[PDB]
Amino acid sequence: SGAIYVGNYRVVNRHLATHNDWANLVWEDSSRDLLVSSTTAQGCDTIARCDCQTGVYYCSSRRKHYPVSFSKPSLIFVEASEYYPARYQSHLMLAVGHSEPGDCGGILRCQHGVVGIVSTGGNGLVGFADVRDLLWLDEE
Numbered sequence: 001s002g003a004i005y006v007g008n009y010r011v012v013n014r015h016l017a018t019h020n021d022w023a024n025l026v027w028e029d030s031s032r033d034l035l036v037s038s039t040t041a042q043g044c045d046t047i048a049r050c051d052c053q054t055g056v057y058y059c060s061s062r063r064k065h066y067p068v069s070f071s072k073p074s075l076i077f078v079e080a081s082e083y084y085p086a087r088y089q090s091h092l093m094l095a096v097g098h099s100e101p102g103d104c105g106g107i108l109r110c111q112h113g114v115v116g117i118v119s120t121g122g123n124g125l126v127g128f129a130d131v132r133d134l135l136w137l138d139e140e
């Protein structure tokens, strides 16, 4: 599990979005595994605007933050998970690292702030859904 709390927005994995998230829906994209919903309180996280390929991610299934190198946001093919089939996914970044289904939502962060959230796992790879292209997250 895990979310980004930027201003009055909540950024979650589409596949972990709650009824409350869908009832307060701002934006959602199955191809990115992202959903954004409205909050009443302001959040404590800030979003990276950058092309960094190094950062640190939280891995719940190890209670550990790992420094990683990761690919630039891309269109990757993903093998079947407990929560999705084998399929393609967009705006995905890959690193070498541990990712189990429940690690989804872990933040990846660089020197500029939050880069994305864990979205995929398997074969000693962790995939992150990028949020850095979501400039609209900064305002309104």
Ligand SMILES: Cc1n[nH]c(C)c1S(=O)(=O)N(C)C
Binding pocket: 073, 074, 075, 090, 091, 092, 133
């Ligand atoms: C960055 C971006 N904009 N539009 C798409 C599609 C993407 S992508 O990350 O999916 N791509 C580079 C493969």
Ligand SMILES: [Zn+2]
Binding pocket: 048, 049, 050, 051, 052, 110, 111, 112, 113
């Ligand atoms: Zn950065």
